[PDB]
Amino acid sequence: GLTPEQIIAVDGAHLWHPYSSIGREAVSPVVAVAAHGAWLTLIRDGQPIEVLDAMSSWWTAIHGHGHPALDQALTTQLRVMNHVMFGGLTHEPAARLAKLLVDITPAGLDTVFFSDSGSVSVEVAAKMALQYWRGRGLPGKRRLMTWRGGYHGDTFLAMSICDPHGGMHSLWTDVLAAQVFAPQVPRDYDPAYSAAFEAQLAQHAGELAAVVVEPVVQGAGGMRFHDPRYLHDLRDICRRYEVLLIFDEIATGFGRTGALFAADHAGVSPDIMCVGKALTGGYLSLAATLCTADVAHTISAGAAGALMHGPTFMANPLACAVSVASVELLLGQDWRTRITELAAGLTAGLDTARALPAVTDVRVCGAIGVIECDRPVDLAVATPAALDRGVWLRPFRNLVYAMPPYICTPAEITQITSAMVEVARLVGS
Amino acid sequence: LTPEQIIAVDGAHLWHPYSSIGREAVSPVVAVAAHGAWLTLIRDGQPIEVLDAMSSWWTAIHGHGHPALDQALTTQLRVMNHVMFGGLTHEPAARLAKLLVDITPAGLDTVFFSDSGSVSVEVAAKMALQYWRGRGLPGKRRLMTWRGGYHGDTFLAMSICDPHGGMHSLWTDVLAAQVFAPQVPRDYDPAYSAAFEAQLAQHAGELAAVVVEPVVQGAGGMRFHDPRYLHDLRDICRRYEVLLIFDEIATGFGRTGALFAADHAGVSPDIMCVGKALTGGYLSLAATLCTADVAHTISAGAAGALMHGPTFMANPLACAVSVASVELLLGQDWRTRITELAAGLTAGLDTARALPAVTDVRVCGAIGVIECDRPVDLAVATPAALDRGVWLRPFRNLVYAMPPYICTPAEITQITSAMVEVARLVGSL
Numbered sequence A: 001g002l003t004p005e006q007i008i009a010v011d012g013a014h015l016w017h018p019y020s021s022i023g024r025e026a027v028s029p030v031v032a033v034a035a036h037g038a039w040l041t042l043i044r045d046g047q048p049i050e051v052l053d054a055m056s057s058w059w060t061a062i063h064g065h066g067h068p069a070l071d072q073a074l075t076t077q078l079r080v081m082n083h084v085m086f087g088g089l090t091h092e093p094a095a096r097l098a099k100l101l102v103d104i105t106p107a108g109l110d111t112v113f114f115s116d117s118g119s120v121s122v123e124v125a126a127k128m129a130l131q132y133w134r135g136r137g138l139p140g141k142r143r144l145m146t147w148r149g150g151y152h153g154d155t156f157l158a159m160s161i162c163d164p165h166g167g168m169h170s171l172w173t174d175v176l177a178a179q180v181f182a183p184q185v186p187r188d189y190d191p192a193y194s195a196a197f198e199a200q201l202a203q204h205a206g207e208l209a210a211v212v213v214e215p216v217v218q219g220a221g222g223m224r225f226h227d228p229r230y231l232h233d234l235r236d237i238c239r240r241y242e243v244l245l246i247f248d249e250i251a252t253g254f255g256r257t258g259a260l261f262a263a264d265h266a267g268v269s270p271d272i273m274c275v276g277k278a279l280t281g282g283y284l285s286l287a288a289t290l291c292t293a294d295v296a297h298t299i300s301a302g303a304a305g306a307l308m309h310g311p312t313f314m315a316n317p318l319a320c321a322v323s324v325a326s327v328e329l330l331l332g333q334d335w336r337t338r339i340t341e342l343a344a345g346l347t348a349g350l351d352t353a354r355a356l357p358a359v360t361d362v363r364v365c366g367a368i369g370v371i372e373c374d375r376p377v378d379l380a381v382a383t384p385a386a387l388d389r390g391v392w393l394r395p396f397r398n399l400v401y402a403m404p405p406y407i408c409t410p411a412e413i414t415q416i417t418s419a420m421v422e423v424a425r426l427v428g429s
Numbered sequence B: 001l002t003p004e005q006i007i008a009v010d011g012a013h014l015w016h017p018y019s020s021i022g023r024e025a026v027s028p029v030v031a032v033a034a035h036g037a038w039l040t041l042i043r044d045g046q047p048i049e050v051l052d053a054m055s056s057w058w059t060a061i062h063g064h065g066h067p068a069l070d071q072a073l074t075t076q077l078r079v080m081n082h083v084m085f086g087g088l089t090h091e092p093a094a095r096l097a098k099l100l101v102d103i104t105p106a107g108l109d110t111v112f113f114s115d116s117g118s119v120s121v122e123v124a125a126k127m128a129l130q131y132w133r134g135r136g137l138p139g140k141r142r143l144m145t146w147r148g149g150y151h152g153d154t155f156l157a158m159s160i161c162d163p164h165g166g167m168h169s170l171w172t173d174v175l176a177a178q179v180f181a182p183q184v185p186r187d188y189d190p191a192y193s194a195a196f197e198a199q200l201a202q203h204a205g206e207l208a209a210v211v212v213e214p215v216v217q218g219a220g221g222m223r224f225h226d227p228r229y230l231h232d233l234r235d236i237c238r239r240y241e242v243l244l245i246f247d248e249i250a251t252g253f254g255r256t257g258a259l260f261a262a263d264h265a266g267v268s269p270d271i272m273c274v275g276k277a278l279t280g281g282y283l284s285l286a287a288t289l290c291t292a293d294v295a296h297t298i299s300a301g302a303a304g305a306l307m308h309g310p311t312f313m314a315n316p317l318a319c320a321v322s323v324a325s326v327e328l329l330l331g332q333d334w335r336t337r338i339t340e341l342a343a344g345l346t347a348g349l350d351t352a353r354a355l356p357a358v359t360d361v362r363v364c365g366a367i368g369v370i371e372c373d374r375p376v377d378l379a380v381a382t383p384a385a386l387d388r389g390v391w392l393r394p395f396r397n398l399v400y401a402m403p404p405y406i407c408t409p410a411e412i413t414q415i416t417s418a419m420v421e422v423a424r425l426v427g428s429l
């Protein structure tokens, strides 16, 4: 048992946080003591206050926290089987989830490799791509290509295809794999960009295993959106130049961009796809990498005879059980209407920010809203500003943004957008 | 789904650890329940109760559905499933961090939570690299280990796995080129440590860290080595200013007869990884600990922070069950328990030394290994053990167990008897 003060004292001495220091944090983290539906209970001035999780706790909480159907799914599974090793055993949760995932992802993705995080699923995707070409007698095809502005995780291979600036590649001189970067993909569709991407890919085609991109929305590398037609072009380019296409849908999956998967906006299927953040409805760490029958059969028929990967908690029954419930909950409702309403709410709520002096862009895509500013956002100023307004927001660089739970009512979206608009006002002020 | 429908879905759609799709020599066995030391598996359409001799890949130290652990999960679920760790902290994370800092080897003062062992290893390497970069020595970026090791399946993790066991031949030109000392022997030999030092001396200026599994090497061959080697590594690392990293992902939490395997030598590494048994085998969770000096040096460097932050970092649910698992272990006489277990394994496995296909029998804490003279055929071994009411999964030439700590003396003897019978069959053909 620990009080918030004790929690803070332990935390300051002993706990790392994402991309943080020990003993040099500008501001202490805020003690969270509960989470229910769209709301977090945080400690502020020693007292508990309920605030909207505008971030969906980093894209995860699509149905909100403590959804009764999802709580129930976990507890039912807990009474039967917590976990068994996936080496030599299988189980209902894994089979149920894999069937669901193959049915709902872009056509052709027939096999599912479960892992415990997005970064791992990305490494699995790369491993599938590299083993695929090795299975085709082309080990030279081992490099990856992407466009700038991307994020794919924090493990060392994932780092190599992250945006070179966002990813601080200059601090990793001589340690990361050297990958092929195309220029930042633009928002608006310009076939000249695709022509140039193709020309650059063409000269590297013989050394490229895959193009890896986030489809439609680039998250941690800058919350940038691009025309879905670029993905149609990528599919065509990759098809014609024999380079696998990998869509990283770890942030975009399960309805977030207004399609069940962002690939659906372009009506294209990748050869390999990663999913993760929202997969369990934000209960537990779980990710999946899917690939076509062709990819799976080629890997399986190659010299190695198997995909050389196998996490300890692969296909954990508890995480899989809650994921099944989470996906069924999404599919059993009119999610498409729900996201359209959310997008409309975000658009309407963020429209006034356009007029603000420090604001360069306002953009919405499905249940994602972004205010881009002309200068870095002071976090020591912004965080308490949104908290004071009943909203948990986490800006970074020049961006103030939200990816709210799908269960957010119109009143809650208004509340979120208001806080965002106000943080932007203080940036200019 | 019926067991048959599960098998059908599984065969078409599910990857398993280090497996193929469509080319599996045996179907996985359907698991329908797990309670205590026992799994309920479907065999010829009928449910059967068998002992989980593998602890579900080292995870289930307290057995499955332990009331204390089930309870810890459901009571955390009631309050907070998960919140983002960026800007927020919480009681489960603080309680676990406090516990971990106070039971791990002295000087390990900070804790980075992640979702899997492979990730925690990548975090450890990142800590070491950023440490040296913080000291103005970015040339110190390679890792050194001994052969026979396993550290996970992500690309950096792979680079320090045994090159043979990890099939580095398949990964030519993709993996970082690390420094490998020869396999560490079982018995203490001063010449081995002298040679290790001599090799390290040649690379000292380009080495960030030595990374080893202390005392027991797991997936690389279930080999044990004299703890005195760890005292040598510590001294070598100190004199040549190379960080020492212990991977205790398999060895942690009493498994080798000490609380952590480093304790067998009284040695403190600069950085430490834990994972498999961390949650008592309920959920995926791992941790990377480092000293105050490492933490401060990273935090004072150009990045001003450790450049890593998993989505489900410090998941409340996983942390809560981990707190309960660790407390459950510490609140009993675990040392006597493991000693009794080891004695049971030793007594039970002794008769195997006389079998024709057996080259070695070795026990270290709650780990029993029959080393055979040929690779073990799973198609024979699996059903043979199930026939005897035990779930065993041999690998390579090893018939081994790492049973739950809650196994009674009779259950241990039932496990060792099945192990003996499998070993007898291996040489029986």
Ligand SMILES: CC(=O)c1ccc(N2CCN(C(=O)c3cccc(Cl)c3)CC2)cc1
Pocket (backbone or CB within 6 Å): A018, A019, A058, A149, A150, A151, A162, A163, A165, A166, A167, A168, A220, A221, A396, B084, B085, B086, B087, B309, B310, B311, B312, B313
């Ligand atoms: C779990 C959580 O709350 C969290 C918060 C921030 C996190 N970050 C900070 C912003 N990020 C980056 O600035 C970033 C880090 C590396 C590469 C790229 Cl392209 C971007 C991504 C990781 C990750 C997790």
Ligand SMILES: CC(=O)c1ccc(N2CCN(C(=O)c3cccc(Cl)c3)CC2)cc1
Pocket (backbone or CB within 6 Å): A085, A086, A087, A088, A310, A311, A312, A313, A314, B017, B018, B057, B148, B149, B150, B161, B162, B165, B166, B167, B219, B220, B395
């Ligand atoms: C979760 C589970 O049941 C499981 C079973 C076997 C697993 N492996 C991984 C390590 N194995 C290796 O052979 C291995 C794989 C890479 C490097 C090294 Cl040193 C060893 C055996 C199969 C992993 C997970």
Ligand SMILES: *Cc1c(COP(=O)(O)O)cnc(C)c1O
Pocket (backbone or CB within 6 Å): A117, A118, A119, A120, A122, A151, A152, A153, A154, A214, A219, A220, A248, A249, A250, A251, A252, A276, B309, B310, B311, B312
């Ligand atoms: C967060 C993220 C990842 C990495 O996921 P983790 O679970 O944090 O390892 C990979 N790809 C994308 C697009 C992401 O947004």
Ligand SMILES: *Cc1c(COP(=O)(O)O)cnc(C)c1O
Pocket (backbone or CB within 6 Å): A310, A311, A312, A313, B115, B116, B117, B118, B119, B121, B150, B151, B152, B153, B213, B218, B219, B247, B248, B249, B250, B251, B275, B276
């Ligand atoms: C299993 C293991 C790992 C990898 O853990 P995952 O959770 O499977 O990624 C790393 N190191 C050691 C010593 C292990 O036994």
